[PDB]
């Protein structure tokens, strides 16, 4: 609806601050390489012509190490075994895949790993036999809490020899919580006759020990899983070989892009250096914020793409991969489209049961508060996580409140009769700039902690109020036009 040239200028301005801010961050690193090298070990590899990589994120490095050693072979084994089952005995495929998942869990995490996954699943199943929402949620919450206790943690660490395997067990158990909670709640709600046969203990075990999603993979709905595992209609093995090749090309491109970002910009080492963060330029601050969120986006492309590719080979429909974070302009849109699987879990099992969006204003606040509180507790329940949850809860609330206010017939008619449609788009973009500034700030707390958040708040809004703040707001205003204009294509 905007004139073509105006939107073209917005796109140029948006691309401009991304790339110039990236240049600023690249220069600050390469200026403090020696200072950063003695506090953080910069890895040396021949991937980018002699640059050194920052390996401080701990999530990229942890999963990359496990993949080089064990995980890639086990995932590749899953697709080989899955194809053999379909060709030979497709009716029994779910149990074969479950059996492979148990063995793969064992050869990585020992007897204790398989034993603890089974114990959590068994307790959950037995409690679910009571057909109560409340009891199931309490049981899941207690099981989750046991992970984060001091005495339990000491006992767990004695089981393994390297603390790297202990972290893997923690990741695996945290993910399994959502799977068996989902199964137990669906069992509590089952009322149709034909569906009664899909809530047996063997089906729970097959859902839990499904290898592509065992360690970190996204939450996959139980409804999709059960429907495909009973299909007995394979999909032309040649076509599966075709889709594997295309998926591998895109996955390798994403991995190379993430590696490039780490070699060029030491964003993770720099957030670990608070005194340096307080003396870099404001352009450097903006570039560091942008690079952090984009690295997080690309990392989860890779981290969810591998399970997604395996599931598509199996004939499943995985949750959608994240939309690029350079296209997100609001709190509501961000949490609908980044982690689609987790968003679906929260809508079905946390949001609606509390009674969201039906009791009016007060009910919506309470429902959203519960959802954000669980996701904060599920991530570890640290202080910075609660700060992030409070900010995100507040942002979503304000967006919904404003949305309802402008959709009132009186105000809607008044603004329609007095303001042109193009002007209406401009105030929507202007307001989204303030929304997206706060959105970036909240997720910086998630990525870097309370200290990073306080540094950014003081150096963007207080120390540099009249002019630094306005430049950031003006750039985000152009950025928001691009995001809203693009969102008219999927939303």
């Amino acid at each position, epitope marked *: 609806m905007l004139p073509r040239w105006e939107l073209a200028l917005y796109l140029l301005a948006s691309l401009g601050f991304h790339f110039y801010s990236f240049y600023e961050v690249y220069k600050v690193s390469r200026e*403090h390489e*020696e*200072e*950063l090298d*003695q*506090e953080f*070990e910069l890895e040396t590899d021949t991937l980018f012509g002699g640059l050194k990589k920052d390996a401080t994120d701990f999530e990229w490095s942890f999963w990359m190490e496990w993949g080089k050693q064990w995980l890639v072979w086990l995932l590749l084994g899953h697709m080989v075994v899955s194809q053999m089952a379909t060709l030979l005995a497709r009716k029994h495929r779910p149990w074969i895949l479950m059996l492979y998942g148990m063995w793969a869990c064992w050869c990585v995490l020992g007897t204790p790993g398989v034993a603890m996954v089974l114990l959590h699943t068994t307790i959950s199943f037995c409690v679910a036999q009571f057909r109560s929402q409340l009891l199931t949620w309490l049981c899941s919450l207690l099981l989750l809490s046991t992970l984060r206790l*001091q005495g339990v*943690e*000491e006992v767990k*660490r004695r089981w393994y020899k390297t*603390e790297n395997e202990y972290y893997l067990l923690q990741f695996t158990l945290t993910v399994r919580c959502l799977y068996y909670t989902s199964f137990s709640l669906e069992l509590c709600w089952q009322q149709l006759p034909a569906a009664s046969t899909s809530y047996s203990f063997p089906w729970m075990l097959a859902y839990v020990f499904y290898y592509p999603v065992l360690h970190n993979g996204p939450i996959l709905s139980f409804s999709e899983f059960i429907k495909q595992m009973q299909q007995q209609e394979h999909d032309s093995l040649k076509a599966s070989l075709c889709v594997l090749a295309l998926g591998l090309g895109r996955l390798l491109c994403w991995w190379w892009l993430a590696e490039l970002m780490a070699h060029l910009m030491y964003m993770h080492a720099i957030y*670990s*250096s*608070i*005194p*340096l963060l*307080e*003396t870099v330029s404001c352009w450097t601050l903006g570039g560091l914020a942008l690079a952090q969120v984009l690295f997080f986006y690309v990392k989860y492309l890779v981290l969810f793409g591998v399970p997604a590719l395996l599931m598509r080979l199996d004939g499943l429909t995985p949750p959608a991969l994240p939309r690029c974070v350079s296209t997100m302009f609001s709190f509501t849109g961000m949490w609908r489209y980044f982690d689609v699987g987790l968003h679906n879990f929260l809508i079905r099992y946390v949001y609606i049961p509390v009674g969201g969006s039906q009791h009016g204003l007060l009910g919506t606040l309470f429902s959203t508060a519960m959802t954000f509180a669980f996701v904060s507790y599920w991530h570890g329940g640290y202080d910075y996580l609660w700060c992030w949850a409070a900010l995100n809860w507040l942002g979503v609330t304000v967006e919904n409140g404003v949305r309802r206010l402008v959709e009132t017939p009186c105000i809607q008619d008044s603004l329609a009769r007095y303001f042109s449609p193009q002007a209406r788009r401009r105030f929507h973009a202007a307001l989204a700039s303030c929304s997206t500034s706060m959105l970036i700030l909240s997720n910086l707390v998630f990525l870097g902690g309370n200290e990073v958040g306080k540094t950014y708040w003081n150096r963007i809004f207080i120390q540099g109020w009249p002019w630094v703040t306005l430049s950031v707001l003006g750039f985000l205003y152009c950025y928001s036009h691009v995001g809203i204009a693009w969102a008219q294509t999927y939303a």
Partner: antibody
Framework: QVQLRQSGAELAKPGASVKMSCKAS????????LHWIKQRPGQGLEWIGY????????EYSQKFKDRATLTADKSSSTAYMQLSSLTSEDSAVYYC????????????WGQGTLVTVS | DVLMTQTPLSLPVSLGDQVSISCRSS????????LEWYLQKPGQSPKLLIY???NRFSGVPDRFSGSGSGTDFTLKISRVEAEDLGVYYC?????????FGGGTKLEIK
């Protein structure tokens, strides 16, 4: 590399003050911190606080607040620590230490100054 | 705020043996682990030996090793070389404004 040089030994009097300095050299980044550590003759080490010579930032320990004052000179890259209302329990060797880019680890140390409160 | 405890206060050892020094913290310092070990020889100034719980410094020998997971940490010397007679301090880092441990003294004789 970075080298720290401290001032001379001081003989205070009870109920007096001493001001002792520390000059840094060879730093390659802007925001570096200078910490002050006290050591009683047979005892351990206890951190007093840090000053930022060219940023002005300070932190103190709860024990030594309201008795210690940290000052700096940007041009000479020097730091001053002053103790007031001295008593015989403040006789010690006071070290100046310097941190690296994170501010977490004391990688450079001075020779320490001996303070006798008598 | 964090209280840091060191064990033992003194430790006799013969040349060439292995030494183990322990440090305990009232609060977990894991973020990376914010713990350091410092060496002070009797006539000299403290020297930074280990940072980030187990990362050795530049120039320090290979016989020094640091480990620990939660509130419990240890520093081990595989073979004392008689140049190791000093006092060793554990030291919690930027988790809180810094505090030192009591100090463990090695006496060959």
């Amino acid at each position: 590399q970075v080298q720290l040089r401290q001032s001379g030994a001081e003989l205070a009097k009870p109920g007096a003050s001493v001001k002792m300095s520390c000059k840094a050299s060879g730093y390659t980044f802007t925001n570096y911190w200078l910490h002050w550590i006290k050591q009683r003759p047979g005892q351990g080490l206890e951190w007093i606080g840090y000053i930022s010579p060219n940023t002005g930032s300070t932190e103190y320990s709860q024990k030594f607040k309201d008795r210690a004052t940290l000052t700096a000179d940007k041009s000479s890259s020097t730091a001053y620590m002053q103790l007031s209302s001295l008593t015989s329990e403040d006789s010690a060797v006071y070290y100046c230490a310097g941190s690296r880019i994170t501010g977490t680890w004391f990688a450079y140390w001075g020779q320490g100054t001996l303070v006798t409160v008598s | 705020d964090v209280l840091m405890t060191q064990t033992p206060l003194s430790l006799p050892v013969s040349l060439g043996d292995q030494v183990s020094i322990s440090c305990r913290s009232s609060q977990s310092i894991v973020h990376n682990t914010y713990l350091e070990w410092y060496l002070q020889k009797p006539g000299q100034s403290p020297k930074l030996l280990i940072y980030w719980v187990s990362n050795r410094f530049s120039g320090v020998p290979d016989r020094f090793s640091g480990s620990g997971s939660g509130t419990d940490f240890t520093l081990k010397i595989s073979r004392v070389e008689a140049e190791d007679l000093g006092v060793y301090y554990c030291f919690q880092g930027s988790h809180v404004p810094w505090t030192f441990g009591g100090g463990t003294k090695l006496e060959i004789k």
